[PDB]
Structures are given as C-alpha cells and as structure tokens.
Design a protein around this ligand. Sequence first.
Ligand code: WH1
Length: 284
Amino acid sequence: PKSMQCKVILLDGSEYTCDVEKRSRGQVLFDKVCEHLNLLEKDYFGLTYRDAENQKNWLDPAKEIKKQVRSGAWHFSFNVKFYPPDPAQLSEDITRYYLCLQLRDDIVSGRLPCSFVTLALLGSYTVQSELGDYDPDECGSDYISEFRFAPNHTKELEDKVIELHKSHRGMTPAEAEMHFLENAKKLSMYGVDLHHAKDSEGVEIMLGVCASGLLIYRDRLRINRFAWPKVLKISYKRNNFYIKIRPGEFEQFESTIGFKLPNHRAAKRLWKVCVEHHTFFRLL
Ligand SMILES: CN(CCc1ccccn1)C(=O)c1ccccc1
C-alpha cells in the first residue's frame, strides 16, 4: 500500500509530517492533523494548499488529495475555514485557542485591519495568555516583544501593549483568549474571505464571503450586503460568477447580479466558498 508524505504548517508556525495512502481523501489527512492538535470541534477548520497558479485552495475532505494537489507538492496549511460569529458559544477552550492563533496571523498579515488601540488590546491579551501576569524585570523602558502584533510595529504600539498588559493581572489563559475573541469578533473584516472581481460595467470591486452573507466593496462610499437568506441561487460560467437576489415583497421576479473573475478557476473557487458558507451558516 503506497503512502505519500504530507507536510502541514500549523497555526503556531511549526510543521506536522505524516503519511497517508496515495489515493486517500482529504478527510484522512485532516483527521490525523486534528488528532495531533487534540481538536474536537473540527467543523470550523480545514487544510489549504497552493495550486499551479499559487492561489490558496481549500482541500475538499470528500475528494482524493492527489486529484486536488495534482502536479504540486503535498504541502498544506491548517486554517480556520468558518469563523464563528460568537466564539463564546464554542464548547472547548482549545478551539478558541486555535481561532486566536489564526486571528493573530490575520492581523500580522493585514487581512484583518485593526485600529492602533485594538492592535494594542489584542496584543495585551495574547501576552497575558502566553506569559501570564506583567513582570517589570523582563520589560524595561526599551522593551520590544518577540510577539508579532501588527503588520507594522512601532515603539508606541509596544508601549501600549505593556500598559494594557499591566491591567490584566490574575487573568488565566482561557479568560485572556475569550477577551481577545470578544474584541476581534467585532472588527468589520472579521472572518471575511476577500475575492478580487469586476462588476457588469468592468469596475474593480472586492467580494467578501462571511457568516452573515456576501459583501460587495465598491467605493468605500457604497458597500452592498446580501444576507444569506436573500441569496436564492449561486452559479459560475467561464470567468463569470452570478448571484440570484430575492424579489422584495410584492415583486414578481428574482434579480441577477453578475461578476467577472480573473479566470475560470477563480470563479469556481468563489462559487464553492459561497455554497459552503451558505450551508454552514444556514445550520448554525
Ligand atoms: C453582519 N454585518 C455587520 C454589521 C452591519 C450590518 C449592516 C450594516 C452595517 N453593519 C454585515 O456587514 C452583513 C454582512 C452580510 C450581510 C448582511 C450584513
């Protein structure tokens, strides 16, 4: 029985290596990684890989790994797929822990924009969780944390992390992680998967996919939002992505909004993440 070596980048930046039979479905590898992580609430997470165009793709757990990675390396990342709107409702602290690790990368990467004060507050909760109570011995006037808190670090931001860290004395790691999540969950881009697209007139927009629905970012002044219940049908054809928008009460017909994606693979990828979010957030 021939087995392929798999390398998975974990949310703490470490590498897990395992073997699966070469005809294995994605669920087989996912179950091995989740057992390694002692993760029971697995529904929120998945594995990503990079395709021949270097785009992030979700590994479909129901399909053969080899028919997804195709010509590429069996290299993956472990990631949050469905960001819970209310992390307090997750049953386990270790679930909230991995969600925190993912969000820390969302912030450092700039996928999750954040004000100065919120960067410092989220930072302060991580430090409390990871080091425990503030100690002056470690941090002098010139202290700079090993922890990455932001896309761009300043001495002012390091100072504000320390000031808020002092306020958290006696906070336990689970408590600090829950506070981190209570703040992060409110950010306007929390759990929003962004896709570059053009509208029917050729104007460059972004489509965001999240728990609540589909967002169309146009000007900064004019963001259209479609709650999942108002979305009747999702579809793609060639480079185009289509949504069927419900008639407003006493309207005779559904409405249709069309988008141009960069290529056919980018259109299918957006279709699949929309279908999965629609299903996931219809059952929650
Ligand atoms: C849940 N919220 C955030 C609060 C909000 C809602 C409406 C207007 C301003 N801010 C969304 O942006 C949203 C996403 C997709 C469909 C419907 C609403």
